[PDB]
Design an enzyme around this catalytic site. Sequence first.
Site, short mmCIF file in Angstrom:
data_model
loop_
_atom_site.label_atom_id
_atom_site.label_comp_id
_atom_site.label_asym_id
_atom_site.label_seq_id
_atom_site.Cartn_x
_atom_site.Cartn_y
_atom_site.Cartn_z
CG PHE A 140 18.76 -114.69 24.93
CD1 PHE A 140 18.70 -114.14 26.21
CD2 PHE A 140 17.57 -115.02 24.31
CE1 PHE A 140 17.48 -113.91 26.84
CE2 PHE A 140 16.35 -114.80 24.93
CZ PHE A 140 16.30 -114.24 26.20
CB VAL A 179 21.74 -118.48 16.73
CG1 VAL A 179 20.95 -119.77 16.57
CG2 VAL A 179 20.98 -117.56 17.69
CG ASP A 234 9.38 -109.48 20.33
OD1 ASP A 234 8.88 -108.74 19.45
OD2 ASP A 234 10.58 -109.36 20.68
NE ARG A 243 11.49 -107.88 16.25
CZ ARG A 243 10.41 -107.11 16.16
NH1 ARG A 243 10.08 -106.56 14.99
NH2 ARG A 243 9.65 -106.88 17.23
CG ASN A 244 10.94 -112.51 17.00
OD1 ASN A 244 10.52 -111.55 17.66
ND2 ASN A 244 12.23 -112.78 16.89
CG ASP A 246 13.46 -117.41 19.68
OD1 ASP A 246 13.78 -118.55 20.10
OD2 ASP A 246 14.24 -116.70 19.01
C1 LIG Z 1 19.44 -116.74 9.91
C2 LIG Z 1 19.53 -117.95 9.02
N1 LIG Z 1 20.03 -117.96 7.81
N2 LIG Z 1 19.94 -119.25 7.29
C3 LIG Z 1 20.41 -119.67 5.96
C4 LIG Z 1 19.81 -118.79 4.85
C5 LIG Z 1 20.34 -119.28 3.49
O1 LIG Z 1 21.77 -119.28 3.47
C6 LIG Z 1 22.41 -120.04 4.51
C7 LIG Z 1 21.93 -119.54 5.88
C8 LIG Z 1 19.38 -120.04 8.21
C9 LIG Z 1 19.10 -119.27 9.32
C10 LIG Z 1 18.49 -119.77 10.57
N3 LIG Z 1 17.97 -121.04 10.70
C11 LIG Z 1 17.51 -121.16 11.99
N4 LIG Z 1 16.92 -122.16 12.64
C12 LIG Z 1 16.57 -122.02 13.90
C13 LIG Z 1 16.78 -120.85 14.61
C14 LIG Z 1 17.42 -119.76 14.00
C15 LIG Z 1 17.60 -118.43 14.65
C16 LIG Z 1 16.57 -117.96 15.47
C17 LIG Z 1 16.63 -116.69 16.04
C18 LIG Z 1 17.72 -115.85 15.80
C19 LIG Z 1 18.72 -116.29 14.95
C20 LIG Z 1 18.67 -117.56 14.37
C21 LIG Z 1 19.91 -115.43 14.62
C22 LIG Z 1 19.72 -113.96 15.02
C23 LIG Z 1 19.10 -113.80 16.41
C24 LIG Z 1 17.72 -114.44 16.37
N5 LIG Z 1 16.95 -114.27 17.61
C25 LIG Z 1 17.24 -114.84 18.79
O2 LIG Z 1 18.20 -115.58 18.93
C26 LIG Z 1 16.29 -114.55 19.90
N6 LIG Z 1 15.39 -113.57 19.92
C27 LIG Z 1 14.73 -113.70 21.09
C28 LIG Z 1 13.62 -112.81 21.61
C29 LIG Z 1 12.43 -112.88 20.65
C30 LIG Z 1 13.16 -113.29 22.98
C31 LIG Z 1 14.12 -111.37 21.72
N7 LIG Z 1 15.24 -114.74 21.70
O3 LIG Z 1 16.13 -115.25 21.03
C32 LIG Z 1 17.77 -119.93 12.63
N8 LIG Z 1 18.37 -119.13 11.71
#
Ligand SMILES: Cc1nn(C2CCOCC2)cc1-c1nc2nccc(-c3ccc4c(c3)CCC[C@@H]4NC(=O)c3nc(C(C)(C)C)no3)c2[nH]1
Length: 271
Positions: free
Chosen positions: A25, A28, A133, A137-138, A151
């Site tokens: 989408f 983030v 899903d 990764r999720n 998600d």
């Molecule tokens: C990364 C990360 N690194 N760090 C630190 C590590 C140490 O150093 C500093 C950074 C923290 C995070 C981090 N914290 C978070 N808290 C809450 C949510 C997210 C989050 C959830 C989902 C997604 C992302 C991010 C980013 C990529 C896309 C992904 N998918 C969707 O958006 C999606 N997928 C679908 C489907 C399944 C429907 C296809 N819908 O939306 C978080 N990411």
Amino acid sequence: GLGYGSWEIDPKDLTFLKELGTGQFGVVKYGKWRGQYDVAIKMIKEGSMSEDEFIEEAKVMMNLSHEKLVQLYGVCTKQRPIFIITEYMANGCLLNYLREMRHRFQTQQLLEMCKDVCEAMEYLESKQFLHRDLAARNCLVNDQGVVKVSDFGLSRYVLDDEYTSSVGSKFPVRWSPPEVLMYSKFSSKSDIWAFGVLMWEIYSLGKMPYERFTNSETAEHIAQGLRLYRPHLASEKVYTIMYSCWHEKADERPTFKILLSNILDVMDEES
Ligand SMILES: Cc1nn(C2CCOCC2)cc1-c1nc2nccc(-c3ccc4c(c3)CCC[C@@H]4NC(=O)c3nc(C(C)(C)C)no3)c2[nH]1
């Protein structure tokens, strides 16, 4: 205040601080709500989501609460792009966490990650709510090393045929049972199959399932009765649990309540 529902957050109460990544989408970000509280913010890219259908469903999702599910806080829908606001998870996604060899995880720790995810899935099963899903990764990890499911349900609102079609490039072929690949028949038992593949991902420290095959070859081999095999760090008792998720007949796969009981038993036997 005036003009905002229970679900609605005022986007002016948000402070944007870092970019976390890009997915189905769009982007983030990490930020603060009212200058104090950590949050994650999905900024929904134009054209990527069935927005009106999601907003109606968000009312149901606001009522799902469990310590091992990523918590929804609210949505911002009076502007485009719309925002989805959740709990922030400091240690990122489970797949990348598993792949960092410096953690040098012990087998007890690995089974605890499986239990975290099983607790979340048993709760969703109790509300007749499918993830659709489920995969490493999720799932996400917090600052104390606790794993949570992310998600859940959002697949129903994706407008990209390469994700939705069973023969598209982004479809989760390697996490799907035979009846999903052949007839696209989703049910509680397809979440069960996916959970078995996730257990395998955890004990394999994040290797790709069926790593020497394409998606097309994986689908053919699954149909002929081929399965994944035992990761080096998994005991015989742990491997029995993951393999139980892969019965050819959907009705002979366990429930999440049964899987949770089995995991607790192995913890008592191996601890
Ligand atoms: C990364 C990360 N690194 N760090 C630190 C590590 C140490 O150093 C500093 C950074 C923290 C995070 C981090 N914290 C978070 N808290 C809450 C949510 C997210 C989050 C959830 C989902 C997604 C992302 C991010 C980013 C990529 C896309 C992904 N998918 C969707 O958006 C999606 N997928 C679908 C489907 C399944 C429907 C296809 N819908 O939306 C978080 N990411």
